[PDB]
Enzyme design. Structure first.
Site, PDB file in Angstrom:
ATOM      1  N   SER A 104       0.825  -1.207   0.000  1.00  0.00           N
ATOM      2  CA  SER A 104       0.000   0.000   0.000  1.00  0.00           C
ATOM      3  C   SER A 104       0.865   1.267   0.000  1.00  0.00           C
ATOM      4  O   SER A 104       1.741   1.422  -0.849  1.00  0.00           O
ATOM      5  CB  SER A 104      -0.946  -0.031   1.211  1.00  0.00           C
ATOM      6  OG  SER A 104      -1.577   1.215   1.431  1.00  0.00           O
ATOM      7  N   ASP A 152      -8.464  -6.045  -6.576  1.00  0.00           N
ATOM      8  CA  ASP A 152      -8.008  -5.130  -5.522  1.00  0.00           C
ATOM      9  C   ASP A 152      -8.877  -3.874  -5.507  1.00  0.00           C
ATOM     10  O   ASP A 152      -8.900  -3.126  -6.478  1.00  0.00           O
ATOM     11  CB  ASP A 152      -6.530  -4.766  -5.730  1.00  0.00           C
ATOM     12  CG  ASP A 152      -5.943  -3.953  -4.572  1.00  0.00           C
ATOM     13  OD1 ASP A 152      -6.613  -3.020  -4.072  1.00  0.00           O
ATOM     14  OD2 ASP A 152      -4.787  -4.234  -4.181  1.00  0.00           O
ATOM     15  N   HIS A 155      -6.711  -7.047  -1.380  1.00  0.00           N
ATOM     16  CA  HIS A 155      -5.704  -5.993  -1.242  1.00  0.00           C
ATOM     17  C   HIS A 155      -4.622  -6.365  -0.235  1.00  0.00           C
ATOM     18  O   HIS A 155      -3.562  -5.745  -0.193  1.00  0.00           O
ATOM     19  CB  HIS A 155      -6.389  -4.683  -0.821  1.00  0.00           C
ATOM     20  CG  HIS A 155      -5.462  -3.515  -0.666  1.00  0.00           C
ATOM     21  ND1 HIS A 155      -4.675  -3.041  -1.694  1.00  0.00           N
ATOM     22  CD2 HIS A 155      -5.229  -2.699   0.391  1.00  0.00           C
ATOM     23  CE1 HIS A 155      -3.985  -1.995  -1.274  1.00  0.00           C
ATOM     24  NE2 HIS A 155      -4.308  -1.763  -0.013  1.00  0.00           N
TER      25      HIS A 155
HETATM   26  C1  94X Z   1      -4.003   5.455   2.603  1.00  0.00           C
HETATM   27  C2  94X Z   1      -4.868   4.696   1.664  1.00  0.00           C
HETATM   28  C3  94X Z   1      -6.141   5.099   1.490  1.00  0.00           C
HETATM   29  C4  94X Z   1      -7.210   4.468   0.592  1.00  0.00           C
HETATM   30  O1  94X Z   1      -6.585   3.722  -0.426  1.00  0.00           O
HETATM   31  C5  94X Z   1      -8.166   3.473   1.335  1.00  0.00           C
HETATM   32  C6  94X Z   1      -9.464   3.204   0.639  1.00  0.00           C
HETATM   33  C7  94X Z   1      -9.501   2.658  -0.641  1.00  0.00           C
HETATM   34  C8  94X Z   1     -10.714   2.405  -1.281  1.00  0.00           C
HETATM   35  C9  94X Z   1     -11.883   2.711  -0.624  1.00  0.00           C
HETATM   36 BR1  94X Z   1     -13.573   2.354  -1.523  1.00  0.00          BR
HETATM   37  C10 94X Z   1     -11.903   3.256   0.642  1.00  0.00           C
HETATM   38  C11 94X Z   1     -10.686   3.501   1.266  1.00  0.00           C
HETATM   39  C12 94X Z   1      -4.190   3.477   0.971  1.00  0.00           C
HETATM   40  O2  94X Z   1      -4.905   2.512   0.641  1.00  0.00           O
HETATM   41  O3  94X Z   1      -2.942   3.555   0.789  1.00  0.00           O
END
Ligand code: 94X
Length: 265
Positions: free
Chosen positions: A94, A215, A244
């Site tokens: 991530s 993902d 993910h």
């Molecule tokens: C910090 C960060 C935030 C976002 O990606 C998290 C996320 C992704 C998708 C959804 Br729908 C809701 C929240 C990461 O995944 O690196």
């Protein structure tokens, strides 16, 4: 130096070869616990918590300094330098995938190989660039997080894990709920603003991109984009699994890719 305690640095295993495990959003270093024993027989493994992890004292979070990912890079480099580690492989999930990319540009001689899991250089869509999110969608995430964090997290945990793996959902939910809501929103905002597309070519280290079948934060086309633009030798490794967080949900499958990637560097 002081970071070694603040970010809960741990070093385990045995060997010539140093491997750094850097966790992603919503977890701490414990997300690596299930794959760790697949590595510790032949590798010296460094683990640490990102400053935004719930297991790090929230009084240490600097809302100013950490509104750019460069600050997270500074922390990683400070840890490796304190440990007097001149060369390592880096595994990042991530946000840590982005940190690893940036770190390898800052200190090319330090990183012998990058393994990127759940990785993206930009989440916002652009022309001919499918990051998976429009501005308005990103803003709705922020709003949801701010208004009702518990509900947003409860909803997000199963989506992120993707696959039907109760223990992974439970374990991801625990660490997500462990984060302080304002810190979680802040990092979320910082990552969504980040656009590493223009510096991908500056990366020199060989790289393995791990792709799963689905993902929620990373379109299937991103891995090919990364392979195309990363400045070193890049291979995409494919996990026949959904989600993910394969290190949580499919540690056996991921272990084989990791041991494959870390055999030579
Ligand atoms: C910090 C960060 C935030 C976002 O990606 C998290 C996320 C992704 C998708 C959804 Br729908 C809701 C929240 C990461 O995944 O690196």
């Amino acid at each position: 130096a002081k970071l070694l305690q603040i970010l809960n640095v741990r070093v385990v295993g045995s060997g010539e070869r140093v491997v750094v495990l850097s966790h992603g959003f919503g977890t701490d270093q414990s997300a690596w616990s299930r794959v760790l024993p697949y590595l510790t027989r032949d590798h010296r493994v460094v683990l640490y918590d990102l400053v935004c992890a719930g297991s790090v004292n929230p009084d240490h979070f600097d809302f100013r300094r950490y509104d750019n990912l460069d600050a997270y890079v500074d922390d990683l480099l400070a840890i490796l330098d304190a440990l007097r580690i001149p060369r390592c492989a880096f595994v990042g999930h991530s946000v840590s995938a982005m940190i690893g990319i940036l770190a390898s540009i800052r200190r090319p001689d330090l990183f012998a190989k990058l393994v990127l899991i759940g990785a993206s250089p930009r989440f916002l869509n652009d022309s001919d660039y499918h990051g998976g999110f429009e501005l308005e969608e990103i803003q709705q995430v922020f709003d949801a997080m701010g208004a009702n964090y518990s509900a947003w997290a409860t909803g997000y945990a199963p989506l992120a894990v993707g696959a039907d793996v109760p223990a992974a959902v439970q374990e991801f939910s625990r660490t997500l709920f462990n984060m302080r809501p304002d810190i979680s929103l802040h990092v979320c905002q910082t990552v969504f603003k980040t656009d590493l597309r223009g510096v991908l070519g500056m990366v020199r280290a060989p790289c393995v991109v791990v792709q799963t079948t689905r993902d929620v934060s990373v379109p299937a086309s991103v891995a090919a984009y990364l392979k195309a633009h990363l400045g070193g030798r890049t291979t995409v490794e494919f996990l026949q699994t959904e989600g993910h967080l394969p290190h949580l949900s499919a540690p056996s499958l991921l272990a084989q890719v990791l041991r494959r990637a870390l055999a030579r560097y």
